[PDB]
């Protein structure tokens, strides 16, 4: 009853925590995204809404340089017009839900930046591979 049993950090465990502690376990939010005659079409139209919005983030991940690696550096620099925050804070001061509000204007500039920064790097691998 003393509660000493190991209790692994469950789903959404660091959801209020900082980024340096939320990025410790990212797989737990990843893996509960696919698994977990008219009330069968409410099962059907929940399943076929789940697999497109799973495939859409797996495609936006796929069309960058990050096939299934789930954490990846890139080459674009961080323009301070986007966030203007210090680096030493934004890994232990703020939180991720505060980040999605803190960045949501500046999204679709980054998402537009990622395809061209990947396909330019892509053709540069092709120009490297073509000469040899």
């Amino acid at each position: 009853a003393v509660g000493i049993g190991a209790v692994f950090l469950g789903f959404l465990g660091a959801a209020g925590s900082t980024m340096g502690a939320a990025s410790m376990t990212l797989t737990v939010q990843a893996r509960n995204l696919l698994s977990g005659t008219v009330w069968g079409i409410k099962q059907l139209q929940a399943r076929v809404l789940a697999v497109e919005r799973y495939l859409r983030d797996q495609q936006l991940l796929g069309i960058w340089g990050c096939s299934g690696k789930l954490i990846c550096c890139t080459n674009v620099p961080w323009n301070s017009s986007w966030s203007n925050r210090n680096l030493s804070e934004i890994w232990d001061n703020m939180t991720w839900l505060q980040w999605d509000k803190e960045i949501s204007n500046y999204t679709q500039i980054i998402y537009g930046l990622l395809e061209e920064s990947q396909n330019q790097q892509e053709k540069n691998e092709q120009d490297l591979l073509a000469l040899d």
Partner: antibody
Amino acid sequence: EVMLVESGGGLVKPGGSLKLSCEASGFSFGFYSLSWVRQTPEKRLEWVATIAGSGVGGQTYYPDSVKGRFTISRDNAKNTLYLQMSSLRSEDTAVFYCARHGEGKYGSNFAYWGQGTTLTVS
Amino acid sequence: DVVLTQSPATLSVTPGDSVSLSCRASQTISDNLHWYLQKSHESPRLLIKYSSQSISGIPSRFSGSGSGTDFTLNINSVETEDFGMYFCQQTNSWPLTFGAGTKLEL
């Protein structure tokens, strides 16, 4: 498998201080609550300290005979457990074992014990 | 505090026989009682968890039973390697406490 290897035992005068160590392997160290239990020369087992795991709350627990005197801590990144002793007494003389608990609801038991390091206070 | 009383303190049995070791708690611990074997010159080894739950790697001859305050560890054909010091342990309340041990001799 689970391996627990303690070090730091020695002969200490009463009132002195001593840090024991337990180097663990074979499991996800931070998730488990870990304890020090000592075995007296009469072979009696007396629980000495517990520090909860990262998903257990990470608090420390001590019995009344040592509370305010003994401090258990862990450094999860290197998978090492520590037992910091101050105001030592001759009654503390024992073999000290590091022990790992189980998982979930059925895991507050000691699941694995180390080899032990000997403390003699006289 | 929960006091754990192990009985008997010492018991001599011939290898091949079966034994029942008692551990009695000063308060109810619903099922929070575990058993350990410590052989001579060795560290303790977990035998039985939460009154009755078996442990991977421990032989099937170790069995546990009991509920509340009274718990029993059965060893149903004792082997030479089973002789040693036997401990019960409670997790119902702080502080964690042990029984005094049963010494099994050959």
